[PDB]
Amino acid sequence: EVLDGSRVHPETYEWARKMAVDALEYDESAEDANPAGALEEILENPERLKDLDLDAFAEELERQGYGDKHITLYDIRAELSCRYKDLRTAYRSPNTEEIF
Amino acid sequence: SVDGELEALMENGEGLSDKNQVLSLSRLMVRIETLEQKLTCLELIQNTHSQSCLKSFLERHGLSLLWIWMAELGDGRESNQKLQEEIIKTLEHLPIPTKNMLEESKVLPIIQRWSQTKTVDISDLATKLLDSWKDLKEVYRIPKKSQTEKEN
């Protein structure tokens, strides 16, 4: 149930699984190769996500009928690269002028 | 002995009846080198009517095993038609559910090559093999063809 710790919306779950399995080039010989094992594994091994032609995948989703997903898939890649990465700016000490 | 163990699988007539028999055949095929051992396995698999057993042969590198047995024969010999006959009868009999299994195992390019490379007709058999793989289940692979360099 691991994507619950990520921005990948439930909509997008199924595409993410596919990204993880394909990024590892994981075992496809039986249904015993569950996608959750690929998630955990790729989550530990993020460099494997980074080399995929996601642009073609978006074309495929366009082809299945989902319209443009180019930016959506670049977001699932960023989620798996670091889940729920907090985007707040780095905490930094108040500036001298702020202090004053 | 590979031959003795293989004939022990033939002994039930119904081909490979169970998972241990298929695993044993897989391990036999990993050790098989002679023409009659290959012909016998092929006939045994053709005689194997159990769908799960055939699928498990494929799971157990079955297409890659057939591809190796085909490669040793070379790209054009007539005596090899005796073996190619059993190989294609077996490949035809095997229930491959996805097209990328064939890309991984590399059996398809040899069947194309043999169909062109002019007693059951191996070109007819090779032609009978090509069509059944078009109907294979929905798969796409995000191509790893990317020129973006792994985001540093």
CSV table of C-alpha atoms in Angstrom, one decimal:
chain,number,residue,atom,x,y,z
A,1,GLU,CA,0.0,0.0,0.0
A,2,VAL,CA,3.1,2.1,-0.2
A,3,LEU,CA,2.1,4.9,-2.5
A,4,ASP,CA,-0.2,6.2,0.2
A,5,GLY,CA,3.0,7.9,1.4
A,6,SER,CA,3.1,9.8,-1.9
A,7,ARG,CA,1.6,12.3,-4.1
A,8,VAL,CA,0.7,9.8,-6.8
A,9,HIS,CA,-3.0,10.1,-6.7
A,10,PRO,CA,-5.1,7.0,-6.6
A,11,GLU,CA,-5.8,7.8,-10.3
A,12,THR,CA,-2.2,7.5,-11.1
A,13,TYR,CA,-1.4,4.4,-9.0
A,14,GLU,CA,-1.7,2.0,-11.8
A,15,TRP,CA,0.7,4.0,-14.0
A,16,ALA,CA,3.2,4.2,-11.3
A,17,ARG,CA,3.3,0.4,-10.8
A,18,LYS,CA,4.0,0.1,-14.4
A,19,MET,CA,6.8,2.6,-14.2
A,20,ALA,CA,8.4,0.7,-11.3
A,21,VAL,CA,8.2,-2.7,-13.0
A,22,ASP,CA,9.5,-1.4,-16.3
A,23,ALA,CA,12.3,0.8,-14.7
A,24,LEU,CA,13.7,-2.3,-13.0
A,25,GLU,CA,12.9,-4.4,-16.1
A,26,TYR,CA,11.4,-6.7,-13.5
A,27,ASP,CA,10.3,-10.4,-13.8
A,28,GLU,CA,7.2,-10.8,-15.9
A,29,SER,CA,7.0,-14.7,-16.1
A,30,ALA,CA,4.3,-15.1,-13.4
A,31,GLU,CA,1.7,-13.1,-11.4
A,32,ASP,CA,3.9,-14.0,-8.4
A,33,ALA,CA,6.1,-11.0,-9.5
A,34,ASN,CA,3.8,-8.6,-7.5
A,35,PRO,CA,4.2,-4.9,-8.3
A,36,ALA,CA,4.6,-4.0,-4.6
A,37,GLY,CA,7.9,-5.9,-4.6
A,38,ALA,CA,9.1,-3.7,-7.4
A,39,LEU,CA,7.9,-0.6,-5.6
A,40,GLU,CA,9.8,-1.4,-2.4
A,41,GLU,CA,12.9,-2.4,-4.5
A,42,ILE,CA,12.8,0.8,-6.7
A,43,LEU,CA,12.1,3.0,-3.8
A,44,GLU,CA,15.4,1.7,-2.3
A,45,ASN,CA,17.1,1.9,-5.8
A,46,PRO,CA,15.9,5.3,-7.3
A,47,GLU,CA,18.6,5.5,-10.1
A,48,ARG,CA,16.7,2.8,-12.0
A,49,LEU,CA,13.6,5.2,-12.4
A,50,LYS,CA,15.7,7.9,-13.9
A,51,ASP,CA,16.5,6.1,-17.2
A,52,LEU,CA,13.1,5.6,-18.8
A,53,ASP,CA,11.6,7.1,-22.0
A,54,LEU,CA,8.5,8.4,-20.2
A,55,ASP,CA,7.6,10.6,-23.2
A,56,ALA,CA,6.8,7.5,-25.2
A,57,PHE,CA,4.8,6.3,-22.3
A,58,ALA,CA,2.7,9.4,-22.3
A,59,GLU,CA,2.1,8.9,-26.0
A,60,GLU,CA,0.9,5.5,-25.1
A,61,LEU,CA,-1.5,6.8,-22.5
A,62,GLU,CA,-2.6,9.3,-25.2
A,63,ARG,CA,-3.0,6.4,-27.5
A,64,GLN,CA,-5.1,4.4,-24.9
A,65,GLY,CA,-7.2,7.5,-24.6
A,66,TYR,CA,-6.2,9.3,-21.4
A,67,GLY,CA,-5.0,12.5,-23.2
A,68,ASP,CA,-1.7,14.2,-22.4
A,69,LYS,CA,0.0,12.9,-19.2
A,70,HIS,CA,3.6,14.2,-19.9
A,71,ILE,CA,3.7,16.4,-16.8
A,72,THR,CA,1.8,13.8,-14.6
A,73,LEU,CA,4.3,11.1,-15.4
A,74,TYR,CA,7.3,13.4,-14.6
A,75,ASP,CA,5.6,13.9,-11.2
A,76,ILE,CA,5.3,10.2,-10.5
A,77,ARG,CA,9.0,9.9,-11.3
A,78,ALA,CA,9.8,12.7,-8.8
A,79,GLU,CA,7.5,10.9,-6.2
A,80,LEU,CA,9.3,7.7,-6.5
A,81,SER,CA,12.6,9.5,-6.5
A,82,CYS,CA,11.7,10.9,-3.0
A,83,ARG,CA,8.2,10.3,-1.6
A,84,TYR,CA,6.3,13.2,-0.3
A,85,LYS,CA,9.4,15.3,-0.6
A,86,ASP,CA,8.5,18.4,1.3
A,87,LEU,CA,8.8,21.4,-0.9
A,88,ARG,CA,9.0,24.1,1.7
A,89,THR,CA,12.0,26.2,1.3
A,90,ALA,CA,15.0,25.2,3.5
A,91,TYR,CA,14.6,26.6,7.0
A,92,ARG,CA,17.2,29.4,7.3
A,93,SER,CA,18.2,31.7,10.1
A,94,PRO,CA,16.4,35.1,10.1
A,95,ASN,CA,18.4,37.7,8.2
A,96,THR,CA,20.0,40.5,10.0
A,97,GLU,CA,17.3,42.8,8.6
A,98,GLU,CA,14.6,40.4,9.6
A,99,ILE,CA,16.1,40.3,13.0
A,100,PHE,CA,16.3,44.0,13.3
B,1,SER,CA,21.5,-40.4,-17.1
B,2,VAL,CA,19.6,-37.8,-19.1
B,3,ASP,CA,18.1,-40.4,-21.5
B,4,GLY,CA,16.9,-42.7,-18.6
B,5,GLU,CA,15.4,-39.8,-16.6
B,6,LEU,CA,13.7,-38.5,-19.9
B,7,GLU,CA,12.2,-42.0,-20.7
B,8,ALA,CA,10.9,-42.0,-17.0
B,9,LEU,CA,8.9,-38.9,-18.0
B,10,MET,CA,7.6,-40.6,-21.2
B,11,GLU,CA,6.4,-43.6,-19.0
B,12,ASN,CA,3.0,-42.1,-18.2
B,13,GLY,CA,2.1,-41.3,-21.9
B,14,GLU,CA,0.2,-38.1,-20.9
B,15,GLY,CA,3.4,-36.0,-21.2
B,16,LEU,CA,4.3,-33.9,-18.1
B,17,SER,CA,1.5,-34.5,-15.5
B,18,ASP,CA,2.9,-32.3,-12.7
B,19,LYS,CA,5.1,-29.4,-11.5
B,20,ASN,CA,8.0,-31.8,-10.3
B,21,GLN,CA,7.9,-33.6,-13.7
B,22,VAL,CA,8.1,-30.2,-15.6
B,23,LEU,CA,11.0,-29.1,-13.3
B,24,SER,CA,12.7,-32.4,-13.9
B,25,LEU,CA,12.2,-32.0,-17.7
B,26,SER,CA,13.5,-28.4,-17.4
B,27,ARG,CA,16.6,-29.6,-15.6
B,28,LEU,CA,16.9,-32.5,-18.2
B,29,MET,CA,16.7,-29.9,-21.1
B,30,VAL,CA,19.5,-27.9,-19.2
B,31,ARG,CA,21.7,-31.1,-19.6
B,32,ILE,CA,20.4,-32.3,-23.1
B,33,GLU,CA,22.8,-32.3,-26.0
B,34,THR,CA,21.8,-35.3,-28.4
B,35,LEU,CA,19.2,-35.3,-31.3
B,36,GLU,CA,17.0,-38.0,-29.8
B,37,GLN,CA,17.0,-36.4,-26.4
B,38,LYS,CA,15.7,-33.1,-28.0
B,39,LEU,CA,13.2,-35.0,-30.3
B,40,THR,CA,12.0,-37.0,-27.2
B,41,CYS,CA,11.4,-33.8,-25.1
B,42,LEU,CA,9.6,-32.1,-28.0
B,43,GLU,CA,7.3,-35.2,-28.5
B,44,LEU,CA,6.8,-35.4,-24.7
B,45,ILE,CA,5.8,-31.7,-24.5
B,46,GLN,CA,3.5,-32.1,-27.6
B,47,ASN,CA,2.0,-35.1,-25.7
B,48,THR,CA,1.8,-32.9,-22.6
B,49,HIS,CA,-1.9,-31.8,-22.7
B,50,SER,CA,-1.7,-30.0,-19.3
B,51,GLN,CA,-1.8,-26.2,-19.9
B,52,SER,CA,-0.3,-25.4,-16.5
B,53,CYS,CA,2.7,-27.8,-17.2
B,54,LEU,CA,3.3,-26.2,-20.6
B,55,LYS,CA,3.2,-22.7,-19.1
B,56,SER,CA,5.6,-23.8,-16.4
B,57,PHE,CA,8.0,-25.0,-19.1
B,58,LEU,CA,7.9,-21.5,-20.6
B,59,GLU,CA,8.4,-20.0,-17.0
B,60,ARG,CA,11.5,-22.4,-16.7
B,61,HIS,CA,13.2,-20.7,-19.7
B,62,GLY,CA,11.3,-23.0,-22.1
B,63,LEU,CA,11.4,-20.7,-25.1
B,64,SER,CA,15.1,-20.0,-24.4
B,65,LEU,CA,15.7,-23.8,-24.2
B,66,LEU,CA,14.0,-24.3,-27.6
B,67,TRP,CA,16.0,-21.3,-29.0
B,68,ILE,CA,19.3,-22.9,-27.9
B,69,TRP,CA,18.3,-26.3,-29.5
B,70,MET,CA,17.4,-24.4,-32.7
B,71,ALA,CA,20.7,-22.4,-32.7
B,72,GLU,CA,23.0,-25.6,-32.6
B,73,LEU,CA,21.2,-26.7,-35.9
B,74,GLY,CA,22.5,-23.7,-37.7
B,75,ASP,CA,20.7,-21.5,-40.3
B,76,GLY,CA,19.9,-24.2,-42.9
B,77,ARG,CA,20.3,-28.1,-43.0
B,78,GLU,CA,17.9,-30.8,-44.2
B,79,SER,CA,18.6,-33.5,-41.5
B,80,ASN,CA,17.8,-30.8,-39.0
B,81,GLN,CA,14.2,-30.7,-40.5
B,82,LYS,CA,13.6,-34.0,-38.4
B,83,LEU,CA,14.4,-32.0,-35.3
B,84,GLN,CA,12.8,-28.7,-36.5
B,85,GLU,CA,9.6,-30.7,-37.1
B,86,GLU,CA,9.4,-31.7,-33.5
B,87,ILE,CA,10.6,-28.2,-32.4
B,88,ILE,CA,7.8,-26.4,-34.3
B,89,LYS,CA,5.1,-29.0,-33.3
B,90,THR,CA,6.2,-28.2,-29.7
B,91,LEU,CA,6.3,-24.4,-30.2
B,92,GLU,CA,2.8,-24.5,-31.9
B,93,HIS,CA,1.6,-26.6,-28.9
B,94,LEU,CA,3.1,-24.2,-26.3
B,95,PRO,CA,0.6,-21.6,-25.0
B,96,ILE,CA,2.8,-18.4,-25.0
B,97,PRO,CA,0.5,-15.6,-23.5
B,98,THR,CA,2.7,-12.5,-24.3
B,99,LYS,CA,4.7,-11.3,-27.3
B,100,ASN,CA,7.8,-10.0,-25.3
B,101,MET,CA,8.6,-13.6,-24.1
B,102,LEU,CA,9.5,-14.2,-27.8
B,103,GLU,CA,11.6,-11.0,-27.9
B,104,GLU,CA,13.5,-12.1,-24.7
B,105,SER,CA,13.9,-15.8,-25.7
B,106,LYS,CA,14.8,-14.9,-29.4
B,107,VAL,CA,12.8,-17.9,-30.9
B,108,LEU,CA,10.8,-15.7,-33.4
B,109,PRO,CA,13.8,-14.5,-35.5
B,110,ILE,CA,14.9,-18.1,-36.0
B,111,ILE,CA,11.4,-19.2,-37.2
B,112,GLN,CA,11.4,-16.2,-39.7
B,113,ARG,CA,14.9,-17.2,-40.9
B,114,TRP,CA,14.0,-20.9,-41.2
B,115,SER,CA,10.7,-20.1,-43.0
B,116,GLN,CA,12.8,-18.4,-45.8
B,117,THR,CA,15.5,-21.2,-45.7
B,118,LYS,CA,14.2,-23.6,-48.4
B,119,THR,CA,8.4,-35.4,-44.3
B,120,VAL,CA,6.6,-32.4,-42.7
B,121,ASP,CA,7.4,-29.0,-44.4
B,122,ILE,CA,9.4,-26.8,-42.0
B,123,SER,CA,8.4,-23.7,-43.9
B,124,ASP,CA,4.7,-24.6,-43.4
B,125,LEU,CA,5.4,-25.4,-39.7
B,126,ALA,CA,7.3,-22.1,-39.3
B,127,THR,CA,4.5,-20.2,-41.1
B,128,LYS,CA,1.9,-21.9,-38.8
B,129,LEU,CA,3.9,-20.7,-35.8
B,130,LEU,CA,4.0,-16.9,-36.7
B,131,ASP,CA,0.2,-15.9,-36.5
B,132,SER,CA,-0.7,-17.2,-32.9
B,133,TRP,CA,1.6,-14.6,-31.3
B,134,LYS,CA,-0.2,-11.5,-32.7
B,135,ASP,CA,-3.1,-12.1,-30.2
B,136,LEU,CA,-0.9,-12.0,-27.2
B,137,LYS,CA,-2.1,-10.1,-24.1
B,138,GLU,CA,-1.8,-6.3,-23.7
B,139,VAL,CA,1.8,-5.2,-22.9
B,140,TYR,CA,3.9,-2.2,-23.5
B,141,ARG,CA,7.3,-1.4,-22.1
B,142,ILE,CA,8.3,2.1,-21.4
B,143,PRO,CA,11.3,2.0,-23.6
B,144,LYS,CA,14.6,2.6,-21.8
B,145,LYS,CA,15.7,4.4,-25.1
B,146,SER,CA,16.0,7.7,-23.1
B,147,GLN,CA,18.7,10.3,-23.9
B,148,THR,CA,18.0,12.2,-20.7
B,149,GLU,CA,21.0,11.1,-18.5
B,150,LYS,CA,19.4,9.7,-15.3
B,151,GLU,CA,18.8,13.2,-13.9
B,152,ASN,CA,22.5,13.3,-12.9
